[PDB]
Design an enzyme around this catalytic site. Structure first.
Site, mmCIF file in Angstrom:
data_model
loop_
_atom_site.group_PDB
_atom_site.id
_atom_site.type_symbol
_atom_site.label_atom_id
_atom_site.label_comp_id
_atom_site.label_asym_id
_atom_site.label_seq_id
_atom_site.Cartn_x
_atom_site.Cartn_y
_atom_site.Cartn_z
ATOM 1 N N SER A 134 -4.209 1.019 -3.996
ATOM 2 C CA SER A 134 -3.641 -0.288 -3.648
ATOM 3 C C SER A 134 -4.697 -1.370 -3.397
ATOM 4 O O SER A 134 -4.364 -2.465 -2.942
ATOM 5 C CB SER A 134 -2.717 -0.173 -2.430
ATOM 6 O OG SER A 134 -3.442 0.193 -1.274
ATOM 7 N N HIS A 193 0.820 -1.210 0.000
ATOM 8 C CA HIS A 193 0.000 0.000 0.000
ATOM 9 C C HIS A 193 0.852 1.257 0.000
ATOM 10 O O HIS A 193 0.585 2.192 -0.758
ATOM 11 C CB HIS A 193 -0.939 -0.006 1.221
ATOM 12 C CG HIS A 193 -1.518 1.339 1.542
ATOM 13 N ND1 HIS A 193 -2.502 1.939 0.783
ATOM 14 C CD2 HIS A 193 -1.264 2.188 2.570
ATOM 15 C CE1 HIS A 193 -2.813 3.108 1.321
ATOM 16 N NE2 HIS A 193 -2.066 3.288 2.398
ATOM 17 N N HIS A 222 0.947 5.367 -2.078
ATOM 18 C CA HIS A 222 1.361 6.699 -1.656
ATOM 19 C C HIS A 222 2.557 7.321 -2.357
ATOM 20 O O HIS A 222 2.554 8.507 -2.702
ATOM 21 C CB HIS A 222 1.730 6.652 -0.163
ATOM 22 C CG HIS A 222 0.561 6.598 0.771
ATOM 23 N ND1 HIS A 222 -0.203 7.705 1.079
ATOM 24 C CD2 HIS A 222 0.055 5.573 1.493
ATOM 25 C CE1 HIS A 222 -1.150 7.353 1.934
ATOM 26 N NE2 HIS A 222 -1.021 6.063 2.193
ATOM 27 N N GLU A 228 -5.927 9.415 1.232
ATOM 28 C CA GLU A 228 -6.183 7.968 1.219
ATOM 29 C C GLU A 228 -7.294 7.541 0.247
ATOM 30 O O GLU A 228 -7.160 6.501 -0.406
ATOM 31 C CB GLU A 228 -6.472 7.439 2.637
ATOM 32 C CG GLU A 228 -5.315 7.709 3.633
ATOM 33 C CD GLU A 228 -4.102 6.779 3.476
ATOM 34 O OE1 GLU A 228 -3.084 7.006 4.173
ATOM 35 O OE2 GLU A 228 -4.138 5.820 2.668
HETATM 36 C C1 JCR Z 1 -4.738 10.062 9.685
HETATM 37 C C2 JCR Z 1 -5.188 8.641 10.089
HETATM 38 N N1 JCR Z 1 -4.037 7.899 10.671
HETATM 39 C C3 JCR Z 1 -3.768 8.024 11.971
HETATM 40 O O1 JCR Z 1 -4.472 8.732 12.682
HETATM 41 N N2 JCR Z 1 -2.694 7.346 12.513
HETATM 42 C C4 JCR Z 1 -1.913 6.537 11.711
HETATM 43 O O2 JCR Z 1 -0.957 5.955 12.246
HETATM 44 C C5 JCR Z 1 -2.211 6.437 10.404
HETATM 45 C C6 JCR Z 1 -3.265 7.110 9.901
HETATM 46 N N3 JCR Z 1 -3.363 6.849 8.603
HETATM 47 C C7 JCR Z 1 -2.380 6.015 8.317
HETATM 48 C C8 JCR Z 1 -2.095 5.457 6.933
HETATM 49 C C9 JCR Z 1 -3.273 4.663 6.399
HETATM 50 N N4 JCR Z 1 -3.385 4.332 5.117
HETATM 51 C C10 JCR Z 1 -4.527 3.666 4.986
HETATM 52 C C11 JCR Z 1 -5.098 3.128 3.896
HETATM 53 C C12 JCR Z 1 -6.314 2.459 3.996
HETATM 54 C C13 JCR Z 1 -6.901 2.372 5.252
HETATM 55 C C14 JCR Z 1 -6.262 2.948 6.347
HETATM 56 C C15 JCR Z 1 -5.100 3.584 6.203
HETATM 57 N N5 JCR Z 1 -4.314 4.202 7.093
HETATM 58 N N6 JCR Z 1 -1.653 5.751 9.393
HETATM 59 C C16 JCR Z 1 -0.461 4.843 9.445
HETATM 60 C C17 JCR Z 1 -0.786 3.562 9.923
HETATM 61 C C18 JCR Z 1 -2.091 3.202 10.260
HETATM 62 C C19 JCR Z 1 -2.351 1.918 10.744
HETATM 63 C C20 JCR Z 1 -1.324 0.988 10.895
HETATM 64 C C21 JCR Z 1 -0.022 1.352 10.573
HETATM 65 C C22 JCR Z 1 0.240 2.635 10.092
HETATM 66 FE FE FE Z 2 -2.225 5.011 3.565
#
Ligand code: JCR
Ligand code: FE
Length: 288
Positions: free
Chosen positions: A230, A166, A171, A211
């Site tokens: 993805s 992903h 990204h 996203e």
């Molecule tokens: C702003 C929301 N948000 C947050 O608050 N905190 C995050 O840590 C975060 C995030 N967003 C993403 C990145 C992300 N990409 C996604 C794609 C599909 C579904 C969920 C996703 N979260 N992350 C990174 C992440 C999320 C889950 C597990 C590992 C890393």
């Molecule tokens: Fe993401």
């Protein structure tokens, strides 16, 4: 009072480990001990990382590379007819310089070096989920907190969480685009020291652009959201005609729930990265 926030890129050392290998009960690897140990390996790499370090290079297994290849092959069939022009412009640069191939998983260090040259973005490996405050704070320094592990091989097409496939396919190609990098950085900058309320609204705007965003280009709906780029099934769904779409409008978008285990109920369409950026500037004045 104003909460602590990072003031320079190395300050992310102090929040990037504030993680909120801990698999959910329905995870396809939940009962797989070997995968669990592999996930611990990746999490430890991220926990031990400090700003300034080269991102540890990983020898991916044949199984991991096959999973990547399966996802890579199918998604690349769809990008020409689904992805936005900026995504399509940058993807071949990544095949040339960062080793994006069906039988090779790119290394985060190489991708980070590429992004640093193009837009000043960089990668930080992250162990798992951070608070939205900590996650968005990275963007303020053009740092993308990035997972390094690979989804479980039993289901290459679906993952319950972000994985490196992903990050790399969804990204990275847009972080290489200056207009998108500026848009993303400004979400991070707006979040720094912001109220809990404001951070949550910024996170939701992030979710429905970075996203799961759609954009309109030459009259056509295109995809720029990494979560769509993805996911083979939702990428197709988003442009199918069966999806509900609304104009991106932060005051309205930030009220929408971010779904996790299903397709989104609605997608938001930005006119351009420049316009989405302008709309966020107007919005952040009202919340910060
Ligand atoms: C702003 C929301 N948000 C947050 O608050 N905190 C995050 O840590 C975060 C995030 N967003 C993403 C990145 C992300 N990409 C996604 C794609 C599909 C579904 C969920 C996703 N979260 N992350 C990174 C992440 C999320 C889950 C597990 C590992 C890393
Ligand atoms: Fe993401």
């Amino acid at each position: 009072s104003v909460p602590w926030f990072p003031k320079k890129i190395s300050d992310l050392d102090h929040c990037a480990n504030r993680v909120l290998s801990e698999l959910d009960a329905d995870h396809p690897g939940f009962k797989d001990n070997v995968y669990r140990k592999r996930r611990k390996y990746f999490a430890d790499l991220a926990m031990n990382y400090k700003h300034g370090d080269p991102i540890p290079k990983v020898e991916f297994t044949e199984e991991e590379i096959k999973t990547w290849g399966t996802v890579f092959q199918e998604l690349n069939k769809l990008y020409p007819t689904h992805a936005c022009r900026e995504y399509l412009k940058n993807l071949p640069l990544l095949s040339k310089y960062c080793g994006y191939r069906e039988d090779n998983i790119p290394q985060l260090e190489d991708v980070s070096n590429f992004l640093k040259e193009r837009t000043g973005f960089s990668i930080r490996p992250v162990a798992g989920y951070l608070s939205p405050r900590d996650f968005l704070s990275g963007l303020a320094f053009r740092v993308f907190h990035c997972t390094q592990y690979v989804r479980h091989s039993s289901d290459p097409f679906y993952t319950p969480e972000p994985d490196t496939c992903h990050e790399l396919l969804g990204h990275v190609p847009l972080l290489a685009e200056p207009s998108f990098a500026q848009f993303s950085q400004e979400i991070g900058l707006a979040s720094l020291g912001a109220s809990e309320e404001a951070v949550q609204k910024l996170a939701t705007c992030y979710f429905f652009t970075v996203e799961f965003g759609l954009c309109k280009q030459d009259g056509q709906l295109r995809v720029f959201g990494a979560g769509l780029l993805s996911s083979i099934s939702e990428l197709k769904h988003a442009l199918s005609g069966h999806a509900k779409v609304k104009p991106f409008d932060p005051k309205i978008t930030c009220k929408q729930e971010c779904l996790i285990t299903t397709f989104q109920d609605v997608y938001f369409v930005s006119e351009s990265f420049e316009d989405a950026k302008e709309k966020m500037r107007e919005f952040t004045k009202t919340i910060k």
